[PDB]
Enzyme design. Sequence first.
Site, mmCIF file in Angstrom:
data_model
loop_
_atom_site.group_PDB
_atom_site.id
_atom_site.type_symbol
_atom_site.label_atom_id
_atom_site.label_comp_id
_atom_site.label_asym_id
_atom_site.label_seq_id
_atom_site.Cartn_x
_atom_site.Cartn_y
_atom_site.Cartn_z
ATOM 1 N N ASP A 112 0.811 -1.245 0.000
ATOM 2 C CA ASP A 112 0.000 0.000 0.000
ATOM 3 C C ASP A 112 0.839 1.288 0.000
ATOM 4 O O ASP A 112 0.321 2.372 0.273
ATOM 5 C CB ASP A 112 -1.072 -0.042 1.150
ATOM 6 C CG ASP A 112 -0.485 -0.100 2.511
ATOM 7 O OD1 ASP A 112 0.764 0.129 2.674
ATOM 8 O OD2 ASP A 112 -1.239 -0.453 3.462
ATOM 9 N N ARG A 150 0.989 6.790 0.176
ATOM 10 C CA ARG A 150 0.188 5.783 0.890
ATOM 11 C C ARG A 150 -1.193 5.732 0.280
ATOM 12 O O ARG A 150 -1.848 6.753 0.088
ATOM 13 C CB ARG A 150 0.088 6.155 2.386
ATOM 14 C CG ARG A 150 -0.779 5.292 3.233
ATOM 15 C CD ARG A 150 -0.233 3.857 3.322
ATOM 16 N NE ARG A 150 -0.868 3.057 4.399
ATOM 17 C CZ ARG A 150 -2.097 2.552 4.305
ATOM 18 N NH1 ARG A 150 -2.779 2.618 3.184
ATOM 19 N NH2 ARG A 150 -2.596 1.831 5.304
ATOM 20 N N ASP A 176 -5.733 -1.066 3.660
ATOM 21 C CA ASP A 176 -4.669 -1.553 4.488
ATOM 22 C C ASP A 176 -4.261 -2.928 3.943
ATOM 23 O O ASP A 176 -5.049 -3.884 4.005
ATOM 24 C CB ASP A 176 -5.154 -1.678 5.942
ATOM 25 C CG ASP A 176 -4.003 -1.814 6.936
ATOM 26 O OD1 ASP A 176 -2.875 -1.391 6.642
ATOM 27 O OD2 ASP A 176 -4.308 -2.280 8.062
ATOM 28 N N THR A 177 -3.022 -2.996 3.483
ATOM 29 C CA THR A 177 -2.440 -4.277 3.152
ATOM 30 C C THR A 177 -1.653 -4.812 4.368
ATOM 31 O O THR A 177 -1.162 -4.043 5.165
ATOM 32 C CB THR A 177 -1.508 -4.109 1.926
ATOM 33 O OG1 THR A 177 -0.537 -3.091 2.162
ATOM 34 C CG2 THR A 177 -2.248 -3.845 0.594
ATOM 35 N N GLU A 228 1.595 -6.038 6.375
ATOM 36 C CA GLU A 228 3.012 -5.722 6.283
ATOM 37 C C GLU A 228 3.703 -6.911 5.621
ATOM 38 O O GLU A 228 3.176 -8.042 5.649
ATOM 39 C CB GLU A 228 3.603 -5.408 7.663
ATOM 40 C CG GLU A 228 2.904 -4.289 8.410
ATOM 41 C CD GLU A 228 3.018 -2.944 7.703
ATOM 42 O OE1 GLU A 228 4.121 -2.654 7.216
ATOM 43 O OE2 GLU A 228 1.995 -2.194 7.597
ATOM 44 N N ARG A 284 3.802 11.313 3.905
ATOM 45 C CA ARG A 284 3.409 10.491 2.744
ATOM 46 C C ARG A 284 2.226 11.142 2.062
ATOM 47 O O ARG A 284 1.317 11.652 2.743
ATOM 48 C CB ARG A 284 3.091 9.010 3.134
ATOM 49 C CG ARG A 284 4.175 8.314 3.923
ATOM 50 C CD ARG A 284 3.810 6.895 4.309
ATOM 51 N NE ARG A 284 2.636 6.896 5.203
ATOM 52 C CZ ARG A 284 2.104 5.826 5.744
ATOM 53 N NH1 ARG A 284 2.648 4.651 5.513
ATOM 54 N NH2 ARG A 284 0.989 5.918 6.447
HETATM 55 C C1 LIG Z 1 -4.172 5.660 4.991
HETATM 56 C C2 LIG Z 1 -3.855 6.659 6.060
HETATM 57 C C3 LIG Z 1 -2.916 6.418 7.066
HETATM 58 N N1 LIG Z 1 -2.713 7.367 8.017
HETATM 59 C C4 LIG Z 1 -1.784 7.060 9.132
HETATM 60 C C5 LIG Z 1 -2.612 6.481 10.278
HETATM 61 C C6 LIG Z 1 -1.784 5.448 10.977
HETATM 62 O O1 LIG Z 1 -1.033 6.125 12.020
HETATM 63 P P1 LIG Z 1 -0.269 5.240 13.031
HETATM 64 O O2 LIG Z 1 1.056 5.052 12.304
HETATM 65 O O3 LIG Z 1 -0.118 6.303 14.108
HETATM 66 O O4 LIG Z 1 -0.859 3.913 13.313
HETATM 67 C C7 LIG Z 1 -0.841 5.044 9.797
HETATM 68 C C8 LIG Z 1 -1.183 3.722 9.137
HETATM 69 O O5 LIG Z 1 -0.329 3.602 7.964
HETATM 70 P P2 LIG Z 1 0.340 2.143 7.628
HETATM 71 O O6 LIG Z 1 -0.810 1.218 7.500
HETATM 72 O O7 LIG Z 1 1.074 2.452 6.414
HETATM 73 O O8 LIG Z 1 1.183 1.735 8.811
HETATM 74 O O9 LIG Z 1 -0.878 6.034 8.831
HETATM 75 C C9 LIG Z 1 -3.448 8.588 7.886
HETATM 76 O O10 LIG Z 1 -3.245 9.530 8.785
HETATM 77 N N2 LIG Z 1 -4.326 8.876 6.914
HETATM 78 C C10 LIG Z 1 -4.553 7.910 5.941
HETATM 79 O O11 LIG Z 1 -5.379 8.173 5.100
HETATM 80 CA CA LIG Z 2 -0.198 -1.548 5.919
#
Ligand SMILES: Cc1cn([C@H]2C[C@H](OP(=O)(O)O)[C@@H](COP(=O)(O)O)O2)c(=O)[nH]c1=O
Ligand SMILES: [Ca+2]
Length: 129
Positions: free
Chosen positions: A15, A29, A34-35, A37, A75
Amino acid sequence: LEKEPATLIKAIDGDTVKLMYKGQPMTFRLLLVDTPEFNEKYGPEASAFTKKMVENAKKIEVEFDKGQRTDKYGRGLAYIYADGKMVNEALVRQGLAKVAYVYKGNNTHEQLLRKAEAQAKKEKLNIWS
Ligand SMILES: Cc1cn([C@H]2C[C@H](OP(=O)(O)O)[C@@H](COP(=O)(O)O)O2)c(=O)[nH]c1=O
Ligand SMILES: [Ca+2]
């Protein structure tokens, strides 16, 4: 929403992808998904799926939604298209991502993706198997 040009720099995982957008390198991103890890079940297959889709594309486009365009990690937050096909939706349709991180005002394609998820689940594909 409007599609804008970008070029692939490098696949990263299911993702996230590194693209050049308006001349600058950025990690994107994918919205609304959510994919797993790489280290989790289906994580390599998700990474592989996205990699193939973006590497094989002649044309990558980025589509921002109405709200936040960068997250707290810097991102890009976007829908990503490979030759007109949305990666975000394709991952969900294949059971390689769940609909997730649905935040108000960046949720234009939510029902589209939920419809894909339902069909993936009905098929018991990958994460739903
Ligand atoms: C997809 C997405 C992720 N995020 C943030 C939330 C999560 O924060 P936390 O890192 O604090 O858990 C994290 C999840 O991304 P990943 O799934 O890439 O880890 O990215 C956003 O703020 N907005 C979004 O639209
Ligand atoms: Ca992920």
